[PDB]
Write a protein that binds this ligand. Structure first.
Ligand SMILES: C[C@H](CCC(=O)NCc1ccc(OCCN2CCOCC2)cc1)[C@H]1CC[C@H]2[C@@H]3CC=C4C[C@@H](OS(=O)(=O)O)CC[C@]4(C)[C@H]3CC[C@]12C
Length: 225
């Protein structure tokens, strides 16, 4: 790859990310003081497990659909075979959503933007799996310490998705090549902006995977990508 190719790849990834965010960062930041009242937190906790899962499942489906659009606009992804596109999305879409969450996360009070306001992990009590939700909130907290720019999140999430070690891939070296060009792009961007230090601070692949619920993987969205 040339300097021109790598610079064009950086631009493509960052443009795709920009066009596939549901919410604008500036709006998310302005809304930080808009926190659910105790009455509203109560209302969420009052819902049945099913009622809460129906709401959350829909929001996650939408989030996943934005990740799919992100992938489609990523230079090189649509050139991979259909099997591999699907394998990568199945294994990585939720991981991308969990990274994207830090944009909607407020480290100051440990809240996430959800249905129009900020709320803590106690909003999600009716779902059960309290340890997992805590672990998810802890994960966003750790990511928040890095102070990612949007271009950084864009390049990092591209690499979360384009992982040549996902079991079930049928063009392994082709995915390896795209992954490598994305590695070049990410490392390039970080060197030029003097941000190489974040490489050592990024959570490992295994960490992201452990945060993905079985219940998410069973959502019908994964049969209709
Ligand atoms: C953390 C939360 C829970 C996830 C989870 O997995 N919890 C474990 C669990 C527990 C029980 C369960 O259910 C059992 C009940 N059973 C199941 C079997 O059937 C019977 C009932 C299922 C799962 C999720 C839910 C919604 C997620 C938001 C959805 C959308 C966005 C927008 C996006 O903006 S953008 O600009 O970037 O695009 C940024 C991200 C953000 C903020 C998301 C952030 C994350 C959130 C809060």
């Amino acid at each position: 790859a040339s300097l021109t190719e790598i610079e064009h790849l950086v631009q493509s990834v960052c443009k795709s990310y920009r066009e596939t965010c549901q919410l604008r960062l500036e709006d998310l930041l302005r809304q930080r003081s808009n926190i659910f009242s105790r009455e509203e937190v109560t209302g969420y906790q009052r819902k049945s497990m099913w009622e809460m899962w129906e709401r959350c499942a829909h929001h996650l489906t939408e989030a996943i659909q934005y990740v799919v659009e992100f992938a489609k606009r990523l230079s090189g992804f649509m050139e991979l075979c259909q099997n591999d596109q699907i394998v990568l999305l199945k294994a990585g879409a939720m991981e991308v959503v969990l990274v994207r969450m830090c944009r909607a996360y407020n480290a100051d009070n440990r809240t996430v933007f959800f249905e129009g306001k900020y709320g803590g992990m106690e909003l999600f009590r009716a779902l059960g799996c309290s340890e997992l939700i805590s672990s998810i909130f802890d994960f966003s907290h750790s990511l928040s310490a890095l102070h990612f720019s949007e271009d950084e999140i864009a390049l990092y999430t591209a690499l979360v998705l384009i992982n040549a070690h996902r079991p079930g891939l049928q063009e392994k070296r082709k995915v390896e090549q795209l992954q490598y060009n994305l590695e070049l792009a990410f490392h390039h961007h970080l060197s030029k902006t003097h941000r190489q230090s974040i490489l050592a601070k990024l959570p490992p692949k295994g960490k992201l995977r452990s945060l993905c619920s079985q219940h998410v993987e069973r959502l019908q969205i994964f049969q209709h990508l």
